[model samples]
Structures are given as C-alpha cells and as structure tokens.
Target: MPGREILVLHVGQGGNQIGYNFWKTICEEHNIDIRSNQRKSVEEDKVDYKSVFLVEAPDGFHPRALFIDLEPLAVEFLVKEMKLGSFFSEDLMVLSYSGAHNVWSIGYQTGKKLIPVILEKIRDTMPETLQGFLIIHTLGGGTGSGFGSLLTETLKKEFPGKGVLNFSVLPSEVNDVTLAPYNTVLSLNHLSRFSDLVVLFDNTALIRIVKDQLNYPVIKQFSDLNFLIGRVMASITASLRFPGPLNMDLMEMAHNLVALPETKFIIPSVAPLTKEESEMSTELDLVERCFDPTHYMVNCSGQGKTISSVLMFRGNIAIENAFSIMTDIKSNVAFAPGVHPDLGLKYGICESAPVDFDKEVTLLSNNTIISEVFNRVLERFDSLFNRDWYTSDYVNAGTSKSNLKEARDNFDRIIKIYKEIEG
Candidate 1:
C-alpha cells in the first residue's frame, strides 16, 4: 500500500488542450504524482477525442492529482497535452458522465461522476493516509457553470469528513455576460455550499490592465489566454504552499502579481447580459463578443479571488466605456475592518465616473497600501456572500418547485442590488 497524498483531476472536452498542456507542465514541474488509468470513451455529437496526461504511480509517488473535464474538448485537450495512450489505465483515470455537450451541461454530469470516484479513490488508493482533492472549475459558459455546480453539490455531500476542498473560479462580470444568467443562477445556487470558496476574476478589470500595461496587440485566441491562467495557477499554488494559515492577508500578497495594471488581460464573450435594450446596450454587448476559449482560462488558471476572500457586486455605474470595476476599498484588505489597526487599508481607488470625492469617498485612508486595499475588500466580500450563497439546504433541494423558488429568490436579490446600484 502507498501513502495517500493529493490528486489533480482535469475535466473538459477537446477545446481544453492548451490549458491541459500548460497545467500538465505545471504539475510535472511541481513533482506531483499523477494517476494514470484506462477508461471507456463516449462518442457523441460536438465531442472530439484527444490524448491526456495520465500518471498513476504508488500513492507515495504522487501526492496530488485531479480529474478535469466539462466536455469532449477538455477531455481531448488533456489526452493530447499529457500524451497518454488511454483515458484510464492503472494510474491516470478519465471519467465522463452523460449530459449536455457544453460546459454548463457537462458541469452537472462532471460533479455527479466525481463524488463516487473521489470516495472510492480515497478508500481504495490511500485508505490509511489522509488525502485532499481539489476540484478546479470555471463558472462561465454552458458546461463549466452547470457541471461545476453539480460537482460542487456532490463534493459537499461526500467530502466534509474527508477533507476535500472545492475551489471555483468565477468569470468576470464584464467578460461573460452572454452566459451571465446561467452563470449567476448556478453560482448563487451551488457556490455557497458545494464550494468551500470561489476565486473571482473580473474580465473588465483584466482588459484595463492589458490595454494599459502589457500593450498586447490583441486579447483573443486560447494561446493568448494561457498567460492569464498560468499567472492564476502560480498565485494559487503559492498561496497553498504559504507557510501560514489561509487568510486574507496571504491571499492578497499571493494575488499581488495580478494587481499590476499592465500584467492583466481578459476574454469577454462568455458572459452576455439579458437586458440589451437599455442605454448601455453597446457596453453590455461587448460581453458576448468577447467570449472565446481563451476567456475560460480565467476560471481554470486560479487567478480569481476565493469566495471567502472577495465579494463581487454587479451594478450599473456611470464609468466611461467601462462596463464594471472593482469597487470598495475597505472590503479589499485582509484584516477585518476595525478589527486590527496595523492591518487597515492604506489606499483605495475606484474606476468610476467623475463624482465628488467628498461625497463618493465614504471612507478614505491614505495609509492604505495596494495589497492591503485589495485584500480587505476580498475578505469582507467573502465573509458576507459565502454564508448564504450555497447552503446544503439550497443544493440538496434540487431543481424542483421548492428548490427553484429558493434559487429564483436568490437570483432576484443579487440582480436587484446590481440594478439598483446603477440608479
């Protein structure tokens, strides 16, 4: 018997090849043992076959591994990237469930299939040793959002006692508006309970960084998107490896690399808004136009803030050309507001219309440093939202009459706040 360590699971269809290659490289660099196994492949419309990286050694050989998929694109990408001969063998195992062809549909099935595999893996692979599993997912588009939720729900049921962690990456409000309704619905419904925390990446913010700093010619294509995702993974892995308890301060420092205005970029077409008839129709339309396989990297790369560390408010602000921006300084830092004097925010900035500084600046502190500012906002946001966003009651209720009522109510509240703020 080998020691039970960690497993990395990548779920996607053919389109995720680039990401798979990048992530597999990362895993190899980190020296994490991968599980390789042979499994059956399902043939369906809109699905393609590709090779993936599958490594299964004794439990002690690899401490961490994962199963990643949403559709055939992701699966194919993994296969090709890892250059594995089969989906499942003695080491690496590829698991897929029958469902929708896109991220949303596949997201549900992915979650459904993940629970049993996780339990069995834990029991059979590393019975004596304790192992932790990380399920990385993006909450945008069809399969990512839908299947991501399903997986989260299953994890909550099977993982609490097992020490499993579910981390979700949220798409920026500006980037994925085409799929906003679906993403928002799934996010509000599944995120609270199914996921331990959510990392949010605002495509709107990233675009600003790209245009100002990197000076990249274009922000399209999966290849261009890999940089952002790579950065995210680096930041997250750093945080996990940090020598202290997981908290806001560490998260802020870990994410500091992204704060550089010039280093960030975004993919916008994945999210589309519902009310296009309004005055900001052009701005809202950009969300859909920006959707590409590239943007999905934002979710996969782990660049976003964890749900426990951030709060994202969707509102209509009168900023010039900007669809949305990160607001509130106090919420961005690490220490609880008024909890610790030394940890207080040092700087605060909001990218909005020219408003009266005296009136708009509710609380300004010159002592705020950039890192402190962002972490404070993230911590407060996570504290407030994670509580009710995804509760067990909400998830187990299923997509039924009673459950739907709760789900709809949650959506209404969040949407209303977003709309009211615009006024």
Candidate 2:
C-alpha cells in the first residue's frame, strides 16, 4: 500500500511566518532537532514523519513544503535569521524582490508569470501517493490574497484529483494596508470555489485572545499570534501523524466537515487557551470549550447553527472519554435545518500529547456564523469599492470592473447561504 503524504505550500508573509512556526512545532512534537535535523530520541514508532516529510539520503529529512513569496523579505528572513535552509532545501524557496504593493491586481498579474515555475517545483518534489496540498496564506495582503488566489485556482485545475486544503488568515478591522478588504474579498471567491477545505484564523480574534484571554496585555511581535495558529495546526494534524481509532486523512476530514461543498470554510478552536494543563484535562470541560467562542481562533457572534464538527483529542485519552461527549454534542449544539446533528459530529483521538501539555482538544467546526467574518469583510470592501477609490489599480493590473463586482456578488451569495442556514 502507498503511504499517505501531504505537500504543504506556504505563501506570502503571513503564510511563511506561520508556516515556519508550524514546522518548528511539528519538529518539537516528533523530537526532531531543528538545527541539525537529527532525532532527539529513538521514539520513531510513535509519530510518522513521512506523512508530511521526505527522507533524504544518510538520515536527512526535509519537509515536503514550498515557501512561496512574491517579495523576498519573508523568505530571506527565514533563510538568514531562522536558518530555514537547514530544514529545507534551498530549491524549495521561491521568491522575488518585487512585491505586490498591497494591490490584488498586481499580485495576480505577477503570479501569472510565476505559476509555471511553481507548478514545475511541485512536480519535482511531490510524493508518489500524494494525499493533498495544504496552503497556508493570508486572505488580506496583496501577495497572500492575489498570488495565493491564482495559485489555488491553478492547482485545482492542474491536479483535479487532489484536495487543496487552505489555512487562511482573515484580516482584522484595523489593517496597515487600506486595500486589505479588496484583497480579502477578491481572494475569497477563488477560495470558495477551488479550495476543498478552508480553516480560518482571524487577526481580531488572535488579538483578543492574546490580550484578554491569554492575559498577555501586550504583544511585541506577530509571532505571538502566529504561535496560536501554529498550535491549532499541530493539534489538527496530530491524528494524521499518529495511529488512532479514526485516523482521518485530509480527504476524510473534508468529507466529515464539509457537507456543503461550496461552504467549506471551517473555524478551529483549541482548549487550554489560558488555563493550566491540570485543570484543562477534564474531558467534559475541554469538550465544552470546543463550543465556546472565546476559545475559537476567529472572532464571530457564535449565534449561527453548526453544519458539522470534528472533535480531535491529543494525549493519553480513554475511548470513553472521547465517546461520552457524543451525546452532549448532539443534544446541546444547534444544527442547521436538514442536517442531522448527530451525523455531523465526528471524533478522533491520538495517544501522543503535544509538547508541554498533558492533553489538548481541538474543534474543527463548520458554523453558519462564520459568515459574520465574511460579512465584516464585505462591509469594508463596500466602503472602499463604492467610491471607486482604488479601482484603477486593479483595472490596470488586468482585472476588470465587471469581474470585481462579480467577485463581490459571488461572496454575497455565500454569506446569504450561511445566513439562510441560520434561519
């Protein structure tokens, strides 16, 4: 039998930063040294590295990831400061000096020139029995949104048989770039159509969690927030990397969570957001935390009906500890009309705990309320697009006014679908 392998692609600044953190966490969990690429211990039986990494000759291993950036700054920082080259081949880093200038059009146009090379790189590095592609990107920045959008569409077309799962970072209300709303809305259309599954993280929610929930008071770097994203990434993939009762691959996860193929956006929440490991190990409280919006990685009203949920637990957990919550989830959580609440609830348990924590729980939920996140973006996009403030930038870069309006219209339809689900 062919082994299951996933190829990860990190795009733009946010993607590269968060992706770097994700790799670091994965290594820590598997006891692999970051600098020397050597195993810290001989506990290879516990975790499967080949699920996300390729073994090189002479005991060397490298992640099957492509770090793509329209500008070289993020990648260069990783190479020089983070010493990313030690963990990955220099050939996997695809970058350029010219940036997207916070314009979605410019990024898309530039990506058109780079797509051929990127596809060739995938062909060169991908495993024989590939499970899927995991794209870590931001939905607001120029390169992250524009280049990421084009790349997703191209991947869906070129590899129609494979799944393209996206881990997209949504923009907050306050943004450094004025065009973030446009970039977000425009990229979302492609994501909705092409991405098999989209796991969302909101910047506003990350800030709230850091300041209010985590009680950090102040954040010095974006890495603080990226760490939270990395934790969620690690927890979600734990089952895939370790043997478990319900070892769900990327495809199975999509099938379990995404009932509506078009509405594939899912929110992830992890337990122990602030509390100590001792207090958080209670299975019921951890399960309840999965439903709590405060623990959610995205900021939303949490009023919408749930379409589906995949409950994943990491650590030395009992079968009863996991299954006992099945009744609680089915009885308490609100499900959309026609959706069997019990059917949408799925469970998986991995015996390996994340580093430092005794146990952890991650909730991957498809909720109608996620539309609120999209609705907020629409409001921001409308504010600027209505006045034609930055329309010319996109028009000159190759996107048409009609196309922009159509993208907005498409997004509106998605929001309406979720809204109707709530009703």
Candidate 3:
C-alpha cells in the first residue's frame, strides 16, 4: 500500500461487478480499509489519496470512461443503467459507435474514438502519484475486441511513461465465427505490442471450472461474468502485494503469472475417427487449446492424461505460458482424462529439438497490418464518395452496404494469406 500507486480501470458491460468484487474480496481478506465514501462523486474519487491500497482506497482517479457500442438501444441501456453509477463522476464520459454488430466497423470506430479520449485523459487527469494503469475488458463481442485494441494503442501513445497493462477475458472459439476473428486479431495485436502485459481468460475454461466446482450449467449468466471479473481483479491485487520470482518486466509479467508445473499441454492426434470421435475431437481440441494452464494454479479435475501431441521446450517459454499450453494440449487430444481421474501427464519425455534463441516473434494479426489494409481500401472508397457512388437516383443507392461488404471480403482474403504464411 505504501509503495507504488496502481489504478484499475474497468471498461465494458456485463462484467463491472466482477472487477468491483475482486477489489472488495481482496480488501476483506487483507483487512484493508475500504473508503466507500470516496466513491460518492467522480471528482472526489480523483484526488483522494493517490496511493491507497487497491483493497482500501479513498476514490482516486477521474472516471474518464468510454463505452463503444453500435446498437442505439443497447448503447442507451448501458449509458443509463450501467455506467451512471453513484460512484461515477462528471468526468466519466460514454460514447457509442454505429455498427456494433460488425467487427471491422467496430474496430474503426473504436480506434477513432479511443485515440483522442485516451490522449486527453492522460494529458488532463494524470495524478501526481499514479504508478500505472490497467485496462480491463471482456472480449465477448465486437465492441470489446475492436475498442479494446484501440484503447491499448491509444494508451501506449499517450502514456508511454506509465505502465500499461491489459486484462482481457476471451470468449470461447465455440462462439460464432465473426466474433472469433475480431477477438483473435485484437488479442494477437494488442498483446504483441500495445499492452505491457496481457492476461487472457477463456470463457470455456471458466465454464468447466463452474461445472466442476459449483455444478453450474455451461452457459454462463451475467452474474457469472461479474464473479469472474472479481476473481481476476482480486488475483491481480494479490500478485501485486506478493510478487513472484521474476522482476516485473510489465511486458513479460503475464507469462510468469500464469505458468505452473502441473498444467497439461494438450495437442490432439488427428488421423481418422468415427462420427462421435470427430465431434469429440473438435470439442477436445477447443478445450485443450483454450485452457489457461499457467493461470489455473490449484489442481482441479482435468490434468495431463488427455495430451496427444506435446511440444516441450527447455527452461520457460513466454508465449506458451501466456497462451496456456496445458489447455491447448487438453483440448486438442481426443481421449483426455475426465474430470476427476489422473493427476496429470507423467511421461517426462524431452525431444532434443535444437532451440533457436535468435528467433524473432512476429504477430500475424496486428494493427499495423490492419491499418495498412484499411488505408488502401479507404483511398479507393474515398474516390467512390467523391463520384457520388450513392446517388439517390439509383435503385440501390447506398454505398454503405456495398463498401462494407467489399472491405470485409478484402480483409478476409488478406488475413487468410497473412495467416497461412506467418501463422
């Protein structure tokens, strides 16, 4: 509490409660003071003690918030009911973007809005004693993925002197196709550069936890999101208090935070299978690849038995730890151990694959790539705008639909090529 000051910025809908709960739990556990009164107004929250423990705090930090949404009704609902908190202040701002339903549109709009607001916030509201900023968002839909990346980029530019961390909750690949691509791109890009640290939460993994621990259904409710957010926040706070072996190199911190020895790295052996086996193969792979073995420390149900293809590396690898190698292994393999069976994979087989230390890590999905494509398309689209592409005299006189479709198609083609070559 007396060392460096840390600020937690919660961004997004359906998960604010989780963030709040996380702080609350930490306070209760550590017996830290909770200054509920400081949260009475946003202004009061800003200049309160600049170094209160996250568990105990007089509200400090202006509520410079942004809510990116497309649907008018959903945006309206969030502004009125969600963001307008008694603890929120006049400093809090909420803005919406059209076409929340579309990934590319959401990305562009969020990027445009985020760049300015983040710059303004850093310039105006930066506290004298502030140590760092944490950007938290749930990556369930287009808004979070698109706007989340935009926010990260803005922060990197505006607050280069400060520590910038991103905590993202990733939805399952079991989710719809459109959502997955956007989320993947955002995660890959933001984690590669923008955020110093990226903490990923897989919804599917959480579902397994809920089912095994609480006997809950697979479909998570709004309350579940809140709970999960709280857990993540609390865990972060705990780590802040009691740091691990590695020094906090913000960029690589996320890697050390997640890895554990018991975590299983699952990779499926895909050859041939019956209809049931095929279905199981897909399900298993999804779970395996998505599991955050590094994050889940305490031994639970599923461990190592489900592993098929193992890619072992000497010492500790950063990406593998951050991405959840154990989860990847479990999900990919078909005949994984059930809920309460094996302790984990025991075969300590090491392949003497010549390790290359000079290998450079390149992001297949990055904002730079997207921006390049976007600029080229924008140049072409600008010509159409000048040529009256949407003349009302024409029967289908809307360039919006056609232009959007063209952008999506072009983006898909470019992305495919990029992934095939790099990924």
Candidate 4:
C-alpha cells in the first residue's frame, strides 16, 4: 500500500505562530534545527522523521508546512526566531505586507493578488501521494479569516478528490475586538461549502482549558495558547512521523473519521496535558483524568455522543492499557454498539516522546456540538449585526446584502444539523 502525505498551510498571525510551534515540536522530536536539517551531535539517537520533510527519498527530515502572513512583522518574527530561513525553502514563507486591519474586504481583495505566488510554492512541494490539505487559521482575524477561507475554497475546488480539513481558532469572547464578527461570518460560506472537515477551538474555552488542565492562570498570551494548541496538532501528526504498525497520514485519518458527508466537525481533547511533556507516567489515575471534561480542548457541551474518534497514544503505553482506554471512552460517550461499530474508532500508537514529555494520549472526537460552536458564533453575530454595525464595510468588501443573507441562511441550516444530530 502507498503511504499518504499532506500539505499544511498556516495562514495569518494566529496560524503562523501556532504552525511554528508545530514545527518546533517536530524539530524537538527529531533533535534537529530548522536550518541545519541535521541531527544534533549531542543527541545522536537516530530519528526517522522523513515523512515530515517535503522531499523524502535521498533527503533528510524537514517541515512540510507553508507559512503565510499578510503582514511582514508576524512572518519576519517567526523566521528570525526559528531560524526558518535556514531549512525552509525560499518560496515556502510568503508575506504580502498589506495589513488586513480587521476588515474582511481588505483581506479578501488583497489575497487575490498573491494566489499565484502561493500556488507556485504549493506546486513546488508536491510528493507522490499528496493526500490532502490541512489549513490552520483564526476565524476572527481578517488576514487568516479571509485568506484562509479563500485558500480552502481553492484547494477543494482544485483537488476535489482529496480531503481538506480546517483547524480554526475562534476569537476570544472576553477581551473583545471590533469587526471579528464580520470576518468570522464572511468566512462561513467557504467553510460550509468547501472544507471536508472543520475542527474548532474557541478562545474562551482555550483559556479555561489551560487554567484547569495546565494549572495555569488566565492565559494572557496567544503564544502560550498556541503551545497547547500546537500540541493537539502535533499529536495527530506524531502518529505519522514516528514508527508505528499502522500509521495515519492526514487524509487516511480524516476519511476514516468523517462518517456523514455533512457531519465533519471535530472536538479535540488531550488529557494530563494541554500538549507537551514533564516525564509523566501512564498511571491509571491520570488516565481517568484524561476524559475528565475539564481537560477537554474546549469547555463546551453537546460532545457526549461520539460519532467517531481517533485515540493516539505516545510514550509509555501498553496495548492492554490502550484497549482499556477505548472501553472507558465507549462507555463514557455512550457510543452506540452494532451501529457503525467498525467505522467509529481507530487506534494508533507511537513509542517515542520528546525527552521531557511523558505518556499522553490525544483524542480527536467527531461529535455533534461543534455544530453548537457555530451556532454560538451566530448568536454573537446576530446580537451585534442585527443592531448597529459595519454594514458598509461588508458591502464594500463585495459581500452583498443578498449574498450575506443567503450565506447566513445556509449557516442557520447547518447549525440546525447540530440539534438534529444531538437528538
């Protein structure tokens, strides 16, 4: 059987920062620097991270990611800090230097001018079995929200046979920002029609998850949050990077989990960690806490029933412990028996761990209520959009009133899918 490969496009400030954390973890696992692309002399232990690099045969491991930012500062800072200029190819990192300023029109319009540049770079990195595209971007920001949506539409249209999953970060509810509602609503059109699966993480839930799970206080910085977010992403990819009996490259995992064509949203969870290691063990007690709702990726509800889930174990874990964990999951989530039994769950294990980080398990649960998350966005959106708002900004951005209403109606229909699936 041929192995699967994927292309990762990290867009905007949030996506780029979070994406870098992902690469940082990969380098840590492989014990290599981005520039040298060579193993460090100190830790001479061999690592087979060939799957992560762009060119596999006759080449060593490197990041299979393309980082894009509309402004210079974010991409500049990322490249300088990570020494990305060293290992990443010349065309991989792109900067428009045209700030989106939280306006949907500006970002959408500006992104068109740069598609050729981005596509050329994408074409350059093609591997034999290019399975899918995983896009990470914030739904609330102009650049990430606008450009990310455009890319999602393009990728799906261009590669209809391949999977296109989006990892979206919703805005923070507490420290409010202007125009995020517009940016988020505008992006919904693409997400609903184009993307194969969407995984959401909200700011309110992330802060709460961090405080409760990591024993930290009100999470102030996005970097801190990105570290935790990056872990969930890294955990998924870890199954591909490390040695394992059955590996799931991005699309294989995505195709397995997406049972219903319309139902493709995921609720990702990690236990005893937001993601990272501290020399932890596979104690029975910690295993119990992993499912404790508090440590869930987002502190949301309606995730009780599991349509499908991929439980990936890293560090010290026994096959016995693995089977036991599944039993606990099946019982806790009320996973229906004999109905789609063969399709619901898949198990993968990786023995390696970042030196300090210990045994941890990450679960990507495809549940019904991320349907609720979109509904939540709509609630906040109607709360503001119905009253006084930036109607002209959206109109100028080419979002006609009729188009907006149609898109909103489409969203409302999909949001209804959550309630339907809930029952």
Candidate 5:
C-alpha cells in the first residue's frame, strides 16, 4: 500500500447514521486499545494504504472523516459514543438548523451555502497528498440525495483531480416514502456525471442478509439497516485498514471494475455466512457463494453479466488457485441462474484478520443487474410523477422541473449502458 491517503465524507441523516455505525466497525477493527486507555503509538514504515479511517500502522491511524447532517440532533447521535468520538475529530461534524423535509431541491440549494465551513475544516485536517473521498449516503432521502449530489458537484470544481467513490444505498422494495423513486433518480443525475464510481447496496438484501445470514431480527428501522450495511463497508475496507502485502487500493478497485467512464456501478457481495465448518470449506465453496444470488446484497432477480469484478479475500482462506476457480465460475454458471451473476473476475488477497473467525470473501461486481435496480425505482416514480405529488417542493427549492425530468433521462441512459452486457 502506497500513496493512498483518503478523506471520508458522510453526508445527510441516512449517511451520518450509516456512517456512525460504519465508524464503529472500523474502530472495532483497529482501536481495540482505545477502551482500555492503553493507546500504543506506532513506528514509521514505508507502507502505502487507503481508508476512511486512516491507519498507517497497526497501532495508530487517523480517520479524516467529515460527518454532515441538516440537524444538530443527528450530529449528536453520531458523536454520543465516546468510543466513536475517539476515532473522529469533533470540529469537522457540521449541522444545519433547517431540515429539507425530504425535498431534494432544498437540500441541494441549501447545501451549496452549508459546505464552505466544512470544506475549510477538511483542508485543516487532510493530508497534503489527499488521494480522494469516499462518500456514503442513501439515495431516497432529501439530504442524502440532494445535498450529497451537491457535494459531488462541488468536489468536481473544487478539486478536479480527486476521485470520489460513492457508496449509495438503493431503496428497498417496500419503501416508506412514495417519492423514493424521484429522489433516487434526481440524485443519480449528478452521481452519473460527477462521481468517479458508484457502489450500490440494497437495503432489502442488507436487511435480508442480516436477518437470514447473521440472524438479526427483522430490520424495524434505518439504524438496524445502517448497522448491517456498515458491516459490508468494513468487510471491503478491512484489508486497507489492516496490514497486508496484497491489499486492494481504493482507486485500484475502481480502475479494475469500472469498464466505461459512464458505467461505474459495482455490486458488492460477501459470503460464508458461517465459519462453523471453517476448515472443511474449500476456496471453491466461498467463491461460489460470493457469486450466489442469495449472497448478493443487491436483489437483481434475473439474468446478469459483468464486464469486470474485483474479489477481495480476507482471513484463513487460500487464494493460490483463485484464478482457476473464478474462471470456472464464469464459464460454468449460466449468469445468475436464479439471479444475474457476472464475468471478468479480478482477485486480491489480504492475509490480515484480527482474530476474527476463519474467513470472509467479498465480490465487488460490475454488471447489468445494476440497471434493473434503477428499473425498479423508475417503476416507483411512475406512480408519483403522473399524479404530481410533490414537484412543487422540488421546484420551490430551486430545481427546474425540466432538470428533474432530465435526471430521469440520465438514469435511463446509465441503465441502458448496463443492459448492453446482455448476450
């Protein structure tokens, strides 16, 4: 790992909530000594690594994290836990008094004025060679969708050279809000153009995996879903945080999987729900499960193909023959037989696990099934757009009606690109 200094930004309530839990996972992975007050300082090494919570060595690291929300209460929830506070810089948490009321336009317009102080704080803490940002937010809510979009656009003009990896949470099949489709599509309008990469996570499958695989109760609220999705975030980044020879770099994963400049969506799936039968499970068993639709976090229930995929292996798993197994998985399976799977698998191994069971494998897949995810959201928007539910809220907030329609068009274009992978 070299030249991988990263700044992480968590925006809006959904983003902050999810990020709160995410930081917990990262702290668990790195700051075990924090609770005991026996902080061990680190000796320098010429290692290069990437992270939301920056760890240059096993003993010490700094998470150049910026937590943003529209309300002060939300900021408190993020900072309440002293354990989490130890991982964050208190000065960077910014909150606005006004709530967007789920209005994307207000979030966008207001965020423009809200970020100057935040960005200044970022400059105060960021490393000289700041690699880029890893932004986490949900697509359905106003703050996350609108303000998140605003931030991405701001970053483009502010720092043209930096890369932005957006970890966007897709809406579930059963959504509480009717305008979810509108918010999602509107946000994607900017995301499709501004962000370097988009990693889609399904709240539906995240809840499913937590309940079915991890045996959590039915997710009754956002915090529950946030906890599960946060785990997925850690699994992908654990390699970067922990010491290892062959770790997946933040931009490197983006480079390996993003085939076209426009099509940057990557689906991440993790496997081997249980390490109970740890030793007996073959690398084949784990690799197959990563491709298994049941294990996929996104529920793209149909035929799918990926231009490229990056599979990161952690724990006691052997990756010597990963290339052969990946090749077999591509040719043997009929592409998401039950659900869409992909091709062009890239492999990386990080033999660092902090005494956490036997093995865990994650696949960051770039495929067509991603489009269908938007397809579901479009179908949701159809019901609202025809009737004119809350377009005024958006319009009053400074967004033109045509721009909203154009957002729909932009998302459709991205979906079309994903569909091109079909045989």
Candidate 6:
C-alpha cells in the first residue's frame, strides 16, 4: 500500500499526447480497461490502484491526473480520436481556444491568466496523502515550455514541502522550430530552481531507438516515441503503485538522488530494448545493459562521473543478487570524489514486470554527464541569441531582454556545477 499520492499534470499538445499513451500503458499493466473503467484482473489486493487512481464515487477508476493545454485541438483529439472521454472525468481537463504559437513568452503570459483555475483543479483533486506533482511536457513547445515553467514555479511556492518531478522531453538537434532553444533554455531555468527532479528524455534519442533498436520498417510516427516514453514513465512509477521490496516513493527518490537542489536533472535508462515478448536475461545482464548509453532515453556521451543512482528492478530478480551486481557496478562505475561509493547506489526490486516483458530494469541517475545535454542546448541558445533574432516576439509578449539573459545565465551556472562535479 502507498502512503503517498502523486498528481500527474500533462501540459500542452506534446504533454497530452504523451499522457494519453502513458495512461494507456499504465492501464494495460494494471489489467484495466480505460474505455470501460473497470479491471479485468482480480489481483486488486496485490496492487494498489488508489496509489495512482481515484476510486471515488461516480467514476470507475480515473487516474489522479489533470490534463491542461492552451489549445483545444489536442483535447478534441483525445475526445474524438483517442476515445479517452470515458476514462477521464469532465473536470479533469482544462482547454483553451487560443494557441501558444510556439512562443514562450506568449504561453507564459497567457498561462498566467489560466493558472488559478488550474490550481483549483489541483487542489480539488489532491488526496490527503498527496506527495507531490509529476509534470510532463516538451521543452521545445510553446505551451508546455512556457506554461510548464509558470506552473512549476507556482507549485513550488504553493506547496513548499511537496516534490515536483518534471519529465521534460528535449527537442532534437535539428529542430523544425527555430525558437525552440529560447523556450527550452527559459523553461529549464525555472525547472532547475522549482522542480525537485527533472527526468529528461530526448526526441532525437527516441527516434534513434526506434530506427536502430526497434528496427521499424518504415519511417516512424510520433506514436513510436510516445509509446517508448509511456513505458519508461510506467516503469518509473511501478514501485509506488505495486508492492515491492526496497520501495522508494516520490519524496524518497528526491531525498536519495537529488542531494543538491539545483542538480536535479536525471537521465533514465532501461534494459532489453528489443521487441520480443519475453525476456529471460539474467540479473547481471539486465544491470549491465542499463549502463549502456544506447539504453539511455537521452542522447549523451555519459562520460562524466555519476553523482547518485537508483537501480529499480521488476520481475523475479532476487534482492541479494541485485545487491551483488550493484556492488560490482559501484567498483567499476566512476563516482564523484568525497562521495561514498555505497552512498551513491541504491536498489529497488519489484516482483511484477511490465505487462509485455517478463523482466526489466530501469536506471535513474543524477550524473555529471547529463551536462552534455544541457551544453548542447546552451550552444544552440548562444548561437541564436548572438544573432539577436526572435527577441521581438518575446519582448512583444511581455518578457524583457534582461530576463532572457538571466535564464541563459542560469543554464551557464547549472552546467558549471555539473562540470565542477566531474572535476
């Protein structure tokens, strides 16, 4: 049974789409029928549905989540195409007719007007055991990047003790939107200060995994990337939702890994990337594969030393074997100086795997190596800012040039922290 509850908020089109798939994945793993709002399996005692679901009156089992978007199109798609109308209640979604137009300032300024209602929804849906928030958004998008920043900042102030976990999807190196760097950098500044943990996923890496690892025959759709993200999100929260040994809740994760408030960015990796239905890998192989860069959800060299990590396992792996493998990993994997090798690694073992796979392991690490990803975004920002282009759009929307520079400086400081850890 879970003592803490999490409120999932999905902001913008990318957020909503990813949230839909995430819910789909969670429902499948729990043997739930979202369309019917009922469970197919009778193992209710084995798993706690109330940990992530609201099992109150009037509805069958709706996830304790809120879906917010500045535009109405994504909400319409959810209702008309995705058929999630039955799964979600009417009050859980908040949609606006006006669009963000891929401008961070516009989205931020517009979101300010709608935030009160958003907070009200949060307050209404919050349980007595509420732990914190899990916000999912795309870094490159206007609504997600901008509104997500505002919302995270507000949530930090509103619930001072609650943990805020951000699942920010990074834009590709060659992005279609020219203003992506601006949105990403600005959004990251707020997330750095306000969010307790930011689990980053790169679209570039997801696409690569689909093309190379999954080996999809044709050029893939965005659904492929969303599905992969959904799997990871589900896996991350599995321990909280299911009965597991060495369980870590949202606050426990923040406490264990996020030692420094500013260095909360985490890179997550999962093992057994193949499409095969059954996985019979040994505990050693599963742990080893999680260390591989190819298994990482983000694109980075991962050369910098690790600060701390939580290796979560699902399936029949014994805790004693997991401890031994982690001991071997700690000896081989580099860690920051002055930190105890034992203090840097932790284990979580859950008996139930994902619905499809027989067994899996996920690595959630706060490493100095994640600086590489931030550095890439910083370089892009510097290039664009040097030209002094796109300044008018933000200025016209309400943000000043000085504020933009401050946001950029925040990234500089954050990157320096990571580099210092490596040094």
lDDT of 4 by residue, 131-191 (tens): 7888999888888898899899888887787778899887776426677766777777668
**lDDT per residue as tens, model 1, 191-245:** 6444433444444454544544346688774444443443443323321322212
* lDDT (10s digit) by residue, model 3, range 1-423: 244556555544432434444544444433332333234444323222223333222443223233333333443553355443433433434444454443533544645755666456555545655556667665555555556666667666766777676666655534443335433443444444566655445555555545554455554445443454454443333323432222222323333322221111111111111123223333223233323232231122232222122122211224344245455433453322332223233211111111121111101001112233223333444444456553221113222555544434554444343323222
lDDT of 5 by residue, 85-187 (tens): 6555466677788977787788888887877887798777766667788888888888888888888888766887777889888778887666678888888
* Candidate 1 residue spans exceeding 4 A from truth: 1-5, 13-63, 81-91, 101-114, 126-131, 162-167, 171-179, 202-212, 218-223, 239-339, 344-398, 411-423
Each prediction's TM-score against the native?
0.49, 0.95, 0.50, 0.88, 0.89, 0.95
Q: List the global CA lDDT of all models.
A: 0.37, 0.81, 0.40, 0.71, 0.72, 0.81
The per-prediction CA RMSD against the true structure, in angstroms, equals: 15.9, 1.9, 13.9, 3.2, 3.8, 1.9
Q: Which pairs of residues collide in model 6? A: none
**Which is superior by lDDT, 3 or 6?**
6
Model 4 residue 277 distance off true place after TM-score fit, in angstroms = 8.3
Instruction: Give stretches of model 3 more than 4 Å off.
Output: 1-3, 14-20, 23-84, 97-99, 216-220, 239-423
lDDT computed for candidate 5 = 0.72
lDDT (10s digit) by residue, model 6, range 1-423:
454778888899899888888888877777778888777767653555545644444546788888888998876776677788877657788888788899999888898998889888887878656888888999898999999888899898999988888999998868768899999999999898888889998887788777777788865446767888887777877887777876777778777887676889988887766636236677778777677677778887753577988888987666778877767887777788856867887677777788767788888888888788888889999998989988898989987888889999989899998888777
Prediction 1 global C-alpha lDDT:
0.37
Minimum summed lDDT over a 10-residue window in model 3 is located at 358-367
> What's the number of clashes in each of the models?
100, 0, 27, 1, 4, 0
- Model 4 residue runs over 4 Å out of place are 1-3, 42-47, 54-62, 81-83, 87-90, 216-221, 274-288, 301-303, 335-343
lDDT of 2: 0.81
- What lDDT is reached at residue 180 by model 5? 75
Weakest 10 consecutive residues of candidate 4 by summed lDDT: 334-343
